[PDB]
Amino acid sequence: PRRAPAFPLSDIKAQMLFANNIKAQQASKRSFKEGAIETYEGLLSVDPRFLSFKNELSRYLTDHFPANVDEYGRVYGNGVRTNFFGMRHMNGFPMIPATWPLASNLKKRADADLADGPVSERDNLLFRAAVRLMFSDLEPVPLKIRKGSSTCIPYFSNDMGTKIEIAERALEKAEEAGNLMLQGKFDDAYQLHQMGGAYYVVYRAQSTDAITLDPKTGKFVSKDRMVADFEYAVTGGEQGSLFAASKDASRLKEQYGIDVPDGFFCERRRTAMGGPFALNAPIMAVAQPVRNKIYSKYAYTFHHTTRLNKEEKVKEWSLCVATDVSDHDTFWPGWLRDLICDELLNMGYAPWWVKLFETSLKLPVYVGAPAPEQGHTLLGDPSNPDLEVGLSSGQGATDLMGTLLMSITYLVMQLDHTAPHLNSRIKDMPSACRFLDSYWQGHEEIRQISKSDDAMLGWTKGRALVGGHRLFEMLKEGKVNPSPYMKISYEHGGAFLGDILLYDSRREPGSAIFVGNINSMLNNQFSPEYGVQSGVRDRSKRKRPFPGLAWASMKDTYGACPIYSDVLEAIERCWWNAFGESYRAYREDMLKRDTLELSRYVASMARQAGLAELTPIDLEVLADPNKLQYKWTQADVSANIHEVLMHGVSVEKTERFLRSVMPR
Numbered sequence: 004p005r006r007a008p009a010f011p012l013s014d015i016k017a018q019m020l021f022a023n024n025i026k027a028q029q030a031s032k033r034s035f036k037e038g039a040i041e042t043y044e045g046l047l048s049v050d051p052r053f054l055s056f057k058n059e060l061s062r063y064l065t066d067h068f069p070a071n072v073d074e075y076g077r078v079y080g081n082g083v084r085t086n087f088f089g090m091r092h093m094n095g096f097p098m099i100p101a102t103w104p105l106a107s108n109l110k111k112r113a114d115a116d117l118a119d120g121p122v123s124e125r126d127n128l129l130f131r132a133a134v135r136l137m138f139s140d141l142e143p144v145p146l147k148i149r150k151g152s153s154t155c156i157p158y159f160s161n162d163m164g165t166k167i168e169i170a171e172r173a174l175e176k177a178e179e180a181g182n183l184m185l186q187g188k189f190d191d192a193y194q195l196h197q198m199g200g201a202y203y204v205v206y207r208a209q210s211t212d213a214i215t216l217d218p219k220t221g222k223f224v225s226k227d228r229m230v231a232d233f234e235y236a237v238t239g240g241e242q243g244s245l246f247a248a249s250k251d252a253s254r255l256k257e258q259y260g261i262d263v264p265d266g267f268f269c270e271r272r273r274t275a276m277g278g279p280f281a282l283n284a285p286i287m288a289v290a291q292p293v294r295n296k297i298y299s300k301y302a303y304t305f306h307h308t309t310r311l312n313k314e315e316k317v318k319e320w321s322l323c324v325a326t327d328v329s330d331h332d333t334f335w336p337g338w339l340r341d342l343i344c345d346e347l348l349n350m351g352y353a354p355w356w357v358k359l360f361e362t363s364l365k366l367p368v369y370v371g372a373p374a375p376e377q378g379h380t381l382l383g384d385p386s387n388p389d390l391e392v393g394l395s396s397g398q399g400a401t402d403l404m405g406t407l408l409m410s411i412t413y414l415v416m417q418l419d420h421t422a423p424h425l426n427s428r429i430k431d432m433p434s435a436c437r438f439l440d441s442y443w444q445g446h447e448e449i450r451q452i453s454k455s456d457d458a459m460l461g462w463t464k465g466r467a468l469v470g471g472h473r474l475f476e477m478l479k480e481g482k483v484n485p486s487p488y489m490k491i492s493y494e495h496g497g498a499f500l501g502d503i504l505l506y507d508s509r510r511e512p513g514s515a516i517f518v519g520n521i522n523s524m525l526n527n528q529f530s531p532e533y534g535v536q537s538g539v540r541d542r543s544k545r546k547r548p549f550p551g552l553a554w555a556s557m558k559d560t561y562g563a564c565p566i567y568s569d570v571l572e573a574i575e576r577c578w579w580n581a582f583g584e585s586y587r588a589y590r591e592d593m594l595k596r597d598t599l600e601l602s603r604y605v606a607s608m609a610r611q612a613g614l615a616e617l618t619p620i621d622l623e624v625l626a627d628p629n630k631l632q633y634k635w636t637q638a639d640v641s642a643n644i645h646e647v648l649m650h651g652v653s654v655e656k657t658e659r660f661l662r663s664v665m666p667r
């Protein structure tokens with residue numbers, strides 16, 4: 004069922020992806036690299052005192068604070084959902100090998116008994132209504148770009164000036180490029196305007212992953228993570244093998260002279276992709292206005308900020324179902340890309356823009372280095388983009404693609420299993436739009452709060468409530484998938500966008516509260532994804548610009564966890580045992596240094612201004628801007644702080660671009 008073409012780096016098709024500059028050439032050739040991360044300034048993730056600390060703390064906390072999750076996956080009591088062994092990784096050292104990304108997910112979906120298109124006309128109307136509501140009366144805004152982000156294929160530039168020039172040129176030439184693609188001239192569109200080529204595969208660390216302590220043996224067991232070899236990836240699983248990657252860290256002693264304590268493992272590695280910036284810029288210019296619409300008009304379903312903001316919605320429900328989606332991005336259906344494109348064309352969107360959008364979701368992928376002596380291969384032919392990878396992480400609208408799929412998937416689940424009496428309200432496009440508009444505003448007896456693959460489904464009092472309880476029971480049983488679209492189950496320890504839903508004895512949403520996840524505090528403080536990058540002079544370009552600032556927002560973020568104080572005291576005690584120093588004093592010093600450094604970056608901040616005008620969100624984002632890519636949005640951050648992390652193309656250039664894309 005068609006193997007994807009593959010080209011080695013030596014091939015002209017792969018050579019054309021990398022411009023004639025040092026950075027692009029280094030990116031093409033970059034071999035497998037590993038090493039301890041600089042967790043904090045002057046501290047390596049593999050420092051013997053740090054690993055001794057992690058061993059003592061993970062063991063103590065698991066012992067004293069066992070998980071309090073009921074038969075229905077509801078968190079109660081201590082607010083703990085698993086053991087604390089997830090911190091036991093040699094950060095910066097990955098599992099070997101990392102996966103080869105699947106060129107086609109069609110067989111994967113078919114074998115999982117998932118649909119190859121909308122099942123019924125109702126579902127087809129609902130997916131199409133989502134497009135009409137999301138993409139209709141949009142307002143132009145400046146195109147914001149993350150500082151220090153790469154332009155990837157073909158230039159691999161990290162320079163803001165160059166990135167602004169590339170983006171402005173892309174908005175000027177997107178029409179000409181899209182029209183070339185409509186003529187099947189993909190090579191011309193790429194050669195002339197750098198729109199096409201491929202996604203560049205970067206493997207990112209998932210710093211904490213499941214580890215269990217076997218009581219029988221007293222030995223730790225790391226969660227097996229299945230990886231596809233090259234053959235499996237190019238054949239969509241028809242040939243080759245899917246096997247467990249090796250998380251064994253013993254190798255670090257032999258290879259690097261690093262002492263590996265018992266029960267410490269190599270990190271899980273996830274595929275991440277970087278899009279060709281010239282293709283992403285015209286997509287982002289439409290994606291940002293879409294987010295502004297859904298986060299304003301449909302704020303109920305889509306705009307999530309604080310634990311109390313979430314709580315106010317959930318408390319009004321009679322039933323709250325916390326769902327889980329298995330491997331969202333890899334299962335994301337190409338038929339949805341095609342349905343979205345078809346509907347945008349029906350709405351009157353510029354065909355050239357729709358073509359650029361369609362192409363961004365069929366693009367080839369350049370595999371860097373999954374393991375030593377592996378990679379440097381282009382999957383798919385850039386002359387005719389035809390891949391079915393699912394959802395590419397670096398596509399300009401990935402969040403919206405996952406949100407569109409999932410919001411409708413959950414609504415369909417509620418209709419099928421709980422609310423057949425609402426089917427008569429979805430007869431045609433106008434009625435599908437009116438119903439969805441009402442549902443997304445939280446005006447129906449069936450409700451939801453969602454973001455991509457994370458959601459909480461609600462039922463108020465009414466006819467659907469009884470069905471709601473049967474659906475929850477079906478999820479608990481776990482024998483039948485409630486959706487024809489994706490693999491849905493209930494979350495083991497219900498949470499929404501980082502906040503755990505803490506139930507009491509009643510196990511009802513009315514008396515349940517949202518609390519910060521204490522395990523996430525530990526993940527962020529002791530297992531960061533990236534090092535401090537102390538050699539990157541411009542802090543705003545770092546993955547962790549101001550790590551010290553997270554101490555100032557900690558109480559606001561995690562203070563509501565039942566065991567907050569217990570954890571901080573356990574940290575203090577264990578850090579004293581390991582370093583002979585006060586962790587609290589160490590973090591207070593880092594907080595002071597980073598507060599002072601911050602004023603250099605904020606125009607409104609005087610030489611020693613302090614954090615007085617900054618919110619807890621501002622502080623969490625300055626310590627971890629990745630939270631701005633999965634948890635929060637631009638509007639949640641103070642304007643003077645957003646400017647530290649992002650730069651924009653003028654609204655004058657985007658306004659002119661948007662006028663040419665949009666209907667009448």
Ligand SMILES: [Mg+2]
Pocket residue numbers: 327328329330
């Ligand atoms: Mg899952």
Ligand SMILES: [Mg+2]
Pocket residue numbers: 325326457458494497498499500
């Ligand atoms: Mg969740």
